[PDB]
Amino acid sequence: GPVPSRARVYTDVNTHRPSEYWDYESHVVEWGNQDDYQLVRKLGRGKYSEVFEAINITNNEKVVVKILKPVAAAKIKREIKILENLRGGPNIITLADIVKDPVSRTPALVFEHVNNTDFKQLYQTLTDYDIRFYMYEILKALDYCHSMGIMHRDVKPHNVMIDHEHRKLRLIDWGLAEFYHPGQEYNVRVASRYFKGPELLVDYQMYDYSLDMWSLGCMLASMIFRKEPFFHGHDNYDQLVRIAKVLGTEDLYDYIDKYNIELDPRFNDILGRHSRKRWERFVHSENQHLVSPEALDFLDKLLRYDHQSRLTAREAMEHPYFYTV
Ligand SMILES: O=C(O)/C=C/c1ccc(O)cc1
């Protein structure tokens, strides 16, 4: 069957640490006072939760309350443990408290407040310098969680909270985050469609932190080319076809051959034959000021089929693209 794969960085961070750090199931949750928080307005609902803008009435400070919908016991424990392990880390959303919601009866996570400006209005405004700056801020969060044995698995614009006025950035929603264990097979049903790495799209289960780097490359390509999303698939199968019309089919077949992966036969009548496109093909008069040889070289090293051949978050911070910043 498929050839096994290992991360080329932070491979053994979890195996050396004690069981308490990564075994979230055995984690004991130290509850806080639900009454300390007063719900002001609903900010959004999600697939697994409802997010509220709130006020901690002890210190009169704005907070964010994330009330978890009844989904699974294990997922909830995992999110708490990952947030507690990454608390204080560069650009990681700070878990201020864990209270039990009186209505829902499920736990409600309390976070610090970040004055985010809508990505739809923010992506249409970023300068070349800002893309670089914010990309470097995301990279700090990605290298920190990866160094700590954690892969986010849901990197997208909506999971990046930007206080553009204070030039603050937070990587949020660690609900899909998982502990990396070498050789462990994971669920390919992670991340949002447009940011799904080819490993997810081909059903390759032995993936790692490099999955976050492909997702970051998708975000980069959307920002520098002013094309939202960059790879616009109608479904999970058309998603792979979208990647293939840019990266080519030969490198896709080379990748599936390397890991001895069997592609779903449904791809035979839709995948076609595609040559790899040169990046300057997506450059035009409305995005050219955001594009540079450094931007294209950096993007080219993120958007690789082979999860093993992608830049790691630390190498990505070393890129000439970040010299200006
Ligand atoms: O961790 C999370 O899922 C949510 C954190 C968050 C913080 C500020 C917001 O405006 C929205 C969500």
Residue numbers in the entry: 3 to 327
Quoted from the paper:
CK2 is a hetero-tetrameric enzyme composed of two catalytic subunits (α and/or α′) and two regulatory subunits (β and/or β′) which confer stability, control selectivity and enhance enzyme activity. It is an unusual kinase in that it is believed to be constitutively active, without needing external stimulus, such as phosphorylation of the activation loop. CK2 is involved in multiple intracellular pathways including the regulation of cell proliferation and cell growth. Recently, we reported the discovery of a new binding pocket, the αD site, within the catalytic CK2α subunit and described the development of a novel class of inhibitors of CK2α utilising this pocket (CAM4066).
